Design a protein around this ligand. Structure first.
Ligand SMILES: [Mg+2]
Ligand SMILES: [Mg+2]
Ligand SMILES: [Mg+2]
Ligand SMILES: [Mg+2]
Ligand SMILES: [Mg+2]
Ligand SMILES: [Mg+2]
Lengths: 70, 123, 85, 122
RNA sequence: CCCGCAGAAGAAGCACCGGCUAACUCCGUGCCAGCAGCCGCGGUAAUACGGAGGGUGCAAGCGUUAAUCGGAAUUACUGGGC
RNA sequence: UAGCUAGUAGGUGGGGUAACGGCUCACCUAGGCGACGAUCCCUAGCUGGUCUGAGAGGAUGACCAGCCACACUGGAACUGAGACACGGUCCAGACUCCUACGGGAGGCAGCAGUGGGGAAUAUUGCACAAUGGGCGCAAGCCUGAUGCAGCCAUGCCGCGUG
């Protein structure tokens, strides 16, 4: 239901009404774009694995084990 | 220090809070699992850990890990939750006892089968 | 209202009726005493006291009231009597 | 004469305490509601953990009126306060379990047999 | 409880195995799936994942999660600091 | 949580209890408590103990025993040696079930048990055979206290699968 009265003539309000209706539908019916998920970048994964491996190396040489010395 | 100061305002005990509040000193709590999905670990571990969002019988809606490889947990599965942080997903402070309350055990886990709730191969 | 021994309701309420009658009797005699006492004559005071002493003492012996109640009554009433004169 | 906007006490334990008659069911432009007459009401006040929350809209049957019904002979029964018993809005089926206060015989109809049983007097 | 039992005779699971903590190989997977008490393992020889073999340890139980105290001299009076 | 308190704090008298006592009443005075924490708010049954610990301490009060409190909720008495009473009384109340519609009747925090709650906990059993308990001169009865078994690897302990 739409009340169009802004203009001074019914011949103008009679198109103001249809304009309001079509402009309503044209956005109350929109199909908003679907947001697909995003995956971590290749370079970011590479940096993660780099840091992980360097930490692995330092944490490995950081310790105490009798491999050689019986 | 200063025995008089201790007499006036005595030393105290820092009450160590519990890291499993939703259990509130109960070993296990059942939940409905209002969500069930996967989420990627924090910085180094680069995976997709299976997690769920549950509503327990004490109102504490909590995120709970989903142990093992493969499962059949859904929107309305009555599950059972024990403590234990995941240390990987920030926020998961609980788990699920696999192999009880609608949760299936991993497929024929030969090791750690008391865990992960799988019956034994009868031999 | 479960076991037999709710005959005790009757066995107790009959006793209560009799006991209330007896207590009213006792303290009406004591109030007669007090009326004499505030009235202003050791004559009437001691009069009521004589005619009430067996009453209160018997009701004390009857296990209705406890003998110390008769004791305190006689004591302070004799006191009021003697202070009036 | 329990018309619109009439605040009513609750002669049962449904949960309400005062309910406003928002419509007199039965017939068009029907004005009033005698005893047996069903009305449409809303809960203007309910107790905290009642069976019905404040604001609900549902039917109700009047049981006590300050106006008073006249018996077949000319004897009248004027209570001191208008009060009604709640009913389910689909089934008549009163909501409350107990029922307080007295009631009348104009309630002694089929659907109100449960009410007239739960009720203590008349 | 006590006398005959003809026959081994109906009766071992559970966890761990990278370090702390002890007890090691192969296989398959190959940032995946997963494991994890803390550190952490996983991109093809994975003693850390899953399986097999084997080892270690408790056993009519074995572990997991509660929960408490200890270690925690991390509320210190004993027995701490600025 | 910094003020609190007015029957309050005392005095005298009267009354009242089994017993002193503002216990209660009528007067008189201005007390009375409060940083050594009053008051208010939250929590909680207290102890012997228990668990840990080297000890102090910390956590603590499931079992057994001692004390207190409560009996659907609120209040009150009655009787009584003793109760303001678990399986008594009266009133009120919410709930629930009956009805010869006038009336009622009921209180598993006893045992067993149900539904429900939960992660979670057992027979709608047997005997009064000892024990204790009440009654009774006593025999003898009552006792879901007990003594027993039912169930659960729930803990401790011992032996077997050679
Ligand atoms: Mg492995
Ligand atoms: Mg320090
Ligand atoms: Mg006095
Ligand atoms: Mg109850
Ligand atoms: Mg009972
Ligand atoms: Mg019997």
């Amino acid at each position: 239901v739409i009340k169009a009265q802004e203009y001074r003539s019914q011949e103008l309000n009679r198109e103001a009404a249809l304009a309001r209706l079509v402009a309503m539908i044209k956005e109350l019916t929109t199909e908003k774009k679907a947001r697909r998920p995003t995956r971590p970048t290749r370079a970011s994964k590479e940096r993660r694995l780099a840091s992980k491996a360097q930490k692995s190396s330092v944490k490995a040489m950081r310790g105490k084990v009798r491999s050689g010395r019986e | 220090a200063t025995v008089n100061q201790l007499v006036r305002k005595p030393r105290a005990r820092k009450v160590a809070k519990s890291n499993v509040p939703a259990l509130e000193a109960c070993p296990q709590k059942r939940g409905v699992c209002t969500r069930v999905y996967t989420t990627t670990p924090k910085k180094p571990n680069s995976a997709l850990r299976k997690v769920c969002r549950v509503r327990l019988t004490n109102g504490f809606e909590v995120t709970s890990y989903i142990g093992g490889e493969g499962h059949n947990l859904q929107e309305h599965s009555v599950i059972l939750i024990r403590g234990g942080r995941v240390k990987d997903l920030p926020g998961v402070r609980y788990h699920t006892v696999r192999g009880a309350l609608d949760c299936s055990g991993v497929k024929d886990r030969k090791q750690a089968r008391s865990k992960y709730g799988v019956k034994r191969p009868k031999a | 209202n479960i076991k037999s021994a709710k005959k005790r309701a009757i066995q107790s309420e009959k006793a209560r009726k009799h006991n209330a009658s007896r207590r009213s009797m006792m303290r009406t005699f004591i109030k007669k005493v007090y009326a004499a006492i505030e009235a202003g004559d050791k004559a009437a005071a001691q009069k009521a006291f004589n005619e009430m002493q067996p009453i209160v003492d018997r009701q004390a012996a009857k296990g209705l009231i406890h003998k110390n109640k008769a004791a305190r009554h006689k004591a302070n009433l004799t006191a009021q009597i003697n202070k009036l004169a | 004469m329990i018309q619109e906007q009439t605040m009513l006490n609750v002669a049962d334990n449904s949960g309400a305490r005062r309910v406003m008659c928002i419509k007199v069911l039965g017939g068009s432009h029907r004005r009033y509601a005698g005893v047996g007459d069903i009305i449409k009401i809303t809960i203007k006040e309910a107790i905290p953990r009642g069976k019905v929350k404040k604001g609900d809209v549902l039917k109700a049957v009047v049981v006590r009126t300050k106006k008073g019904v006249r018996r077949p002979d000319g004897s009248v029964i004027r209570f001191d306060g208008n009060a009604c018993v709640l009913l389910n809005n689909n089934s008549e089926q009163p909501i409350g379990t107990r029922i307080f206060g007295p009631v009348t015989r104009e309630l002694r109809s089929e659907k109100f047999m449960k009410i007239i049983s739960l009720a203590p007097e008349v």
